[PDB]
Ligand binder design. Structure first.
Ligand SMILES: NC(=O)C[C@H](N)C(=O)O
Ligand SMILES: NC(=O)C[C@H](N)C(=O)O
Ligand SMILES: NC(=O)C[C@H](N)C(=O)O
Ligand SMILES: NC(=O)C[C@H](N)C(=O)O
Ligand SMILES: NC(=O)C[C@H](N)C(=O)O
Ligand SMILES: NC(=O)C[C@H](N)C(=O)O
Ligand SMILES: NC(=O)C[C@H](N)C(=O)O
Ligand SMILES: NC(=O)C[C@H](N)C(=O)O
Ligand SMILES: [Mg+2]
Ligand SMILES: [Mg+2]
Ligand SMILES: [Mg+2]
Ligand SMILES: [Mg+2]
Lengths: 149, 149, 149, 149, 149, 149, 149, 149
């Protein structure tokens, strides 16, 4: 699905506030309230727009220890089953199959280093395909934002 | 600012759909349409709720090359100045001060390897504090989700 | 257990000399010999004060080769049993579960490199969960001190 | 200064409790209350005994973040000057010149990751000799003990 | 087989264009069309000249993602059988037994990172002798040429 | 410029022998001696076909030491200037800007380790941008071949 | 066995030439031909002097490729048996149990990279305890000498 | 200068004992006392035989700390100047320009870790070209021997 500058204008608007009214964007882009409705709806079926949701701040919820963990597996064919075990875990918010040293690269979000220690040892490291982990503790997270379409 | 099980119930709901009706949640948890408005508003002044926005899929917008780049600097004191230069780059969506080998650990989102090559050489590696970069290219991103509060 | 500046004053005093008399600290902080007795006793049940002991110098006892060893295990779930085997060894004075490359990070204190070689090969490396060790020999240990509460 | 089995017997006792009575040890080993006073005093002038102090638990005093930091310098001759700057930092409890990758290997003791981040950026990495740091965060410290002489 | 400067002159000529006529090189080097024919033929039986072929450009055929992959095997004796499995794959254009970290170092030529991901996971990583891969994605390939005999 | 199965059929043939007759291929695929001339000529203006050349074996010409060298630079912005110096070296047959640890990844082809040592010290490492090199020496090169389009 | 400056004087002399006559050293150090005989003989039973032998030059015997190899074993307890297999090999001239990454660090002396390749693959890498090798090829060996007692 | 089986027979003999009699070797191989004198003398002018010297054991002379040090330089062109400074150090017994991570790979022979620490800091790391050292300490040296020609 290709994308007008009308589509981009809508996305910028609704990416900053989901509740900015379609009738205000019509006035703004010089189109009808109705095309705006339809543009948005095409982008939903395209899979571009995935939902409207409140954004939350994990830190102000007391997640003081976020980290990335590189997982090294005992053998590389083990990725699909390792992944299946990891995904059952709520502390794992992201996971990637990347270049470089690691088989899997994941983010886990934890409340304390005591919590992180319990997850590593008892939830992640017990996963039988896993030979080693290397976790990179976030001490500061100054930039967090979005693609600017 | 500590939260109770009503605060969580509200969050779980509005993190799935920003647009669900305060009036349904009132019926759901057995409370007043007005306590829900207020709880949400406190979490806002708390900084727990940061906004209501539509979520977008970069893949569907043609961002086929996600990467994490680890930045190593000429000397470690250089971190504030390198950060300042990187944050002006819109292709940098995230940045972390972490443990381990790198000074700064960033995500860039790009459309192609040709684009990514242009950004590395022209925008990132032209930054004068930066000794070397190591980019980890995402081939697969099977888990992307949120803290489940 | 929280801590006055009376508590800190006592700790500084008794951390430099266990035998500095309670009746001298009373004079010094303008309290009774009896509160000092009781402050110390609360900190003992708190677990803050762990004991009074003579400090010894391993070097003047002929421990010329101290080292840290990073242990890499064949698989990560192996930590609890590896640790249980290590702890039986008197040359292992410390052990840590850390971030980074190693599964376990330990200090061993030895008299000579001939001694260190015998321990590595015959006591540590015979531990069956262990795939590799990497030992960092201390050549100089210029700072050794304490948290300053 | 070489030690016999009376010297060890004395050490083992006073390393467990600084306060045990010379008079009990005399009865224990079958010697004079006065030879024990003297043996201890020689070990003191030998530098084998360095003091009698209370031991403190950092954890109970709220030091939840222990770490080892490996320091890499811009050039290796810089070791004496970097050491001098680090030793003025009270959060650095230990420092080693070791083998392997790092120029200086230090322990810092901190209350939180927020504190540790402040010390890294503001106190440690502002040291001008220092190219990069690599900090290993302690998640667990199951063995902490002494040479058993 | 040793090599005149006549041999080199012929090779330079025919390395730039296979179709440069033998009767033009005769004029050029002051020999007969017939020795040129025979020189070339000796170099063919020597194995120096391996063929005449059109050179193609993989990039203009839409190979946007070339890479090198370092293969680490579970055990080193495994090289011959790993290699035998790899060679069945058309995306593997080169392979080397090198010094350094890797057991095998290979080039694979792919159309997209989606393609590369499918090969890694399903063709290369399924090879049972393989413990890990590390792939170095080519972002730019500015020099590609030949030995200049 | 997209290609059909006639374009591939032509390529497969002329990549094996540049000299096979357009007239045989016409009979082979059931088309005109003249459409084959034209298809080839379009692929030429497309840049898909770059030439017809004889292939040479470096081994048979006495190049016993092939190597890949990873170049690390003093600062990453230095890549264009280091590249320019390397490309003047005829022993450098290939060069890549890749991911991972190195700034530039090159192939050099040499006759002996004595030669290779002379090139490293005298021609490559004299380049002023270059902090360090890491050369991977080819001991075996069992697969060398082409994209199979 | 402790060592006079007479002992050192003899060793320097006989280390440069085994055939420098005892009666010349007597004149030189102002002692008898007979003490010199006896000094040397004590050092032999001490094990200090191990033999008199011609020194050879491997390079002028056509050993163009010397190397060090770091051996990584599948598990660390495997050292004694790995070593026993290695020692049967004539190309292995030295072996060390060292700190750092490798289980065993060895020197092998070879005539060519073709020879080195055959040894690695067929003699060293077939040793079943071995997971990986990393070989450091000597390109230049400018200093080779002796302790100066 | 190529050698036959008489040349080898001579070498094998005199590499075991420099002092065995030319007259016994003549009887042994069935040749003239005089051809043996001559063969040896050619190998001398060839540079194959470099001397006859007594071999010494460093261990028995109290060298308990052998090490290999890998030297990394600030820039790679610095190799000739760093070498020149190192070769003036008598504790450096060997030095190599090798492949892999290090610029220079050296052996130092030392009596204690206290000595080795003094040499590193005061003699080696004071060399201004040197960014960092990595020393591998020998704990065991089970194989030490010669090419068997
Ligand atoms: N995630 C993976 O297994 C990819 C692997 N680290 C590579 O680059 O080859
Ligand atoms: N980002 C930083 O500079 C922190 C550094 N990687 C450390 O662990 O010490
Ligand atoms: N000690 C451990 O297993 C922790 C591990 N090295 C990590 O950082 O993931
Ligand atoms: N601390 C040092 O500078 C010693 C260095 N890491 C070495 O092993 O050579
Ligand atoms: N390809 C190999 O197995 C060689 C190995 N990486 C070495 O240098 O020892
Ligand atoms: N060649 C480069 O500078 C790219 C670098 N190795 C990276 O991955 O970021
Ligand atoms: N050779 C060994 O196994 C020693 C090991 N590399 C260590 O330093 O712990
Ligand atoms: N000693 C050197 O500078 C050579 C370097 N280690 C390389 O492999 O390229
Ligand atoms: Mg959102
Ligand atoms: Mg104490
Ligand atoms: Mg060709
Ligand atoms: Mg000798």
């Amino acid at each position: 699905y290709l994308i007008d500058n009308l589509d981009r204008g809508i996305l910028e608007a609704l990416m900053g506030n989901a509740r900015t009214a379609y009738a205000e964007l019509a006035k703004q882009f010089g189109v009808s309230p109705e095309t705006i409705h339809v543009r948005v709806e095409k982008m939903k079926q395209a899979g571009i727009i995935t939902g409207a949701r409140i954004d939350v701040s994990p830190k102000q919820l007391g997640y003081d220890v976020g980290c990335f963990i590189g997982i090294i597996l005992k053998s590389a064919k083990d990725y699909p089953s390792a992944l299946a075990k990891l995904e059952s875990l709520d502390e794992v918010t992201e996971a990637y199959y990347t270049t470089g040293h690691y088989s899997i690269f994941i983010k886990v979000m934890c409340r304390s280093i005591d919590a992180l220690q319990h997850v590593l040892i008892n939830k992640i490291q017990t996963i039988d395909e896993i030979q080693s982990t290397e976790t990179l503790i976030v001490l500061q997270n100054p930039i967090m934002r979005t693609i600017k379409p």
